[PDB]
Amino acid sequence: MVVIRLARGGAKKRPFYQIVVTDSRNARDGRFIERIGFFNPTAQGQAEKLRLDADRFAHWVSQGAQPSERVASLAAQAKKAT
């Protein structure tokens, strides 16, 4: 199935996630279809904490992509913020 999930990057103890649409069988940090935002759980100061492209999110959900629990929570929080 097609999923929308978080791919980990960044440094040790300081993760930085890219929000990617991908086939679920692919490796976590490997091949993906399209990247639609990022999440930074440790952002400080001027650093942005969450950017999500709602248009692409809705477009991919309308075609059968299944967001993970964390990504669904982040999408709800982003919609509430904006």
Residues contributing to the site for RNA (CB under 7 A): 1-3, 5-18, 23-31, 33, 35, 38, 41-48, 62-66, 68-71, 73-74, 76-77, 80
In the complex, least distance from residue 82 CB atom to RNA, rounded to whole angstroms? 14
Give residue 12's identity as a one-letter amino acid code: K
In the complex, least distance from residue 4 CB atom to RNA, rounded to whole angstroms? 8
DSSP string, 17-64: EEEEEEETTS-TTS--SEEEEEE-TT--TT---EEE-HHHHHHHHTTT
- Closer residue to RNA, CB minimum distance, 56 or 70: 70
